């Protein structure tokens, strides 16, 4: 019953920088904790009572408020600080999370090197063609892959994935896959992805030419 | 003082699963022991917990009517009997204890299990290699697997520099696929082997793909 929403749902902040994230609950509870998930990893607890760091805390975290609006604040975000901050409130049943918030760690451009691999023979003979476009070690997250077959843009034939943020050089990577029938492989000869990147003055291409 | 739960996998739509949350390290019986869950890449949601001591539960009004929490305090452990599960109950499910009637709530937790709910059955992958055309790239593209998860290794561990396992995507056929890359000298392609080994848990699917220029 009761909502707990967080504010930023997601924040880029750089090493050392101030970092705030409000809580704020649809009905007062005057029981609120913080709790830090790093990725594939469980929840751990850091604030509770609105203000007292679990034991082992670093100093930097400390949290404030009253009634309904909460804040965590992280007074100079650490290089291993990055991880979704979820509020929780344990004063009134039901018990209830916040929609957590993800700090990630804002570093420099990186522009993307790419890289990409034809089908194998062996995925073609089963009757499917797989080609793979690879984005490595960049930064920001934002970035566009275009496919192009014989120099016609591709759409709804991809799925992309993208790593999350590096824990040593703060870089993402990506990969987008073109999936087609070996019989429509087989109709053509140009393949192409076509990359853009905030650090990159003009697209990056790279191409091969099937059974090449 | 550990946790540890047991128990998931994959059900059909519609059916039942029990999992486990071993305690170790503490008094099993005098502290709450909650369930919370979390859907791939989504939030944190509690699910109810029960007080190992006289068992009595507290369900979120959510799951009241299908899912039962239950502890055995000679064995230190407590249990999540669900029912009729449906897609949007799959989520990495964990264990943990609080304190409430003190300071605070979750201060240990488990690992996490994850419960996969779907119409898709075990299935390993194929695993096909994304061959290296100074700086190269090269890595294995491990598709057509279900449920999660897989591990991919590289060199049988002996290269973790540079590897990027992709997060897996779900494609239209219900079924997962991701790629492994690493980035290598371009000037090692012609003289150093480069093997990807793939393991599907699930289906104990074991592949050595090895990848050439």
């Known amino acids: 019953d009761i909502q707990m929403t967080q504010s930023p749902s997601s924040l880029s902040a750089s090493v050392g920088d101030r970092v705030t994230i409000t809580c704020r609950s649809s009905?007062?509870?005057?029981?609120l904790e913080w709790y830090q998930q790093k990725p594939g990893k469980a929840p751990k607890l850091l604030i509770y009572?609105?203000?007292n760091r679990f034991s082992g805390v670093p100093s930097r975290f400390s949290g404030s408020g009253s009634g309904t609006d909460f804040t965590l604040t992280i007074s100079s975000l650490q290089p291993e600080d990055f991880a979704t901050y979820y509020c929780?409130?344990?004063?009134?049943?039901?018990?209830?999370f916040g929609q957590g918030t993800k700090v990630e760690i804002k570093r420099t451009v990186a522009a993307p090197s790419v890289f990409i691999f034809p089908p194998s023979d062996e995925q073609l003979k089963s009757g499917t063609a797989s080609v793979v476009c690879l984005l490595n070690n960049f930064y920001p997250r934002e970035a566009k892959v275009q496919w192009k077959v014989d120099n016609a843009l591709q759409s709804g034939n991809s799925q992309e994935s993208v790593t999350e943020q590096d824990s040593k050089d703060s870089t993402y990577s990506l990969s987008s896959t073109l999936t087609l029938s070996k019989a429509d492989y087989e109709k053509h000869k140009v393949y192409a992805c076509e990359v853009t990147h905030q650090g990159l003055s003009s697209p990056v291409t790279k191409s091969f030419n099937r059974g090449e | 003082v550990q946790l540890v739960e047991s128990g998931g996998g994959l059900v059909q739509p519609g059916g039942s699963l029990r999992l486990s949350c071993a305690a170790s390290?503490?008094?099993?019986?005098?502290?709450?022991m909650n369930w919370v869950r979390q859907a791939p890449g989504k939030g944190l949601e509690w699910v109810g917990r029960?007080?190992?001591?006289?068992?009595?539960?507290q369900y979120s009004g959510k799951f009241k009517g299908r899912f039962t929490i239950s502890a055995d305090t000679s064995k230190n452990t407590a249990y999540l009997q669900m029912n009729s599960l449906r897609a949007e109950d799959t989520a990495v499910y964990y264990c943990?204890?609080?304190?409430?009637?003190?300071?605070?709530?979750?201060?240990?937790w488990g690992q996490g299990t994850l419960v996969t709910v779907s119409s898709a059955s075990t299935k390993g992958p194929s695993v096909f290699p994304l061959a290296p055309s100074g700086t190269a790239a090269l890595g294995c593209l491990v598709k057509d697997y279900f449920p999660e998860p897989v591990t991919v290794s590289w060199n049988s561990g002996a290269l973790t520099s540079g590897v990027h396992t992709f997060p897996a995507v779900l494609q239209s056929s219900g079924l997962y696929s991701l790629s492994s890359v690493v980035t290598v000298p371009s000037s090692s392609l012609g003289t150093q082997t480069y093997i990807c080994n793939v393991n599907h848990k699930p289906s104990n699917t074991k592949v050595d793909k090895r990848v050439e220029p």
């Open positions: 009572k609105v203000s």
């Open positions: 390290g503490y008094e099993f019986s005098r502290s709450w």
């Open positions: 029960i007080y190992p001591g006289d068992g009595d539960t």
């Open positions: 929780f409130q344990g004063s009134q049943f039901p018990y209830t």
């Open positions: 943990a204890r609080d304190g409430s009637s003190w300071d605070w709530y979750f201060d240990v």
């Open positions: 009905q007062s509870i005057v029981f």
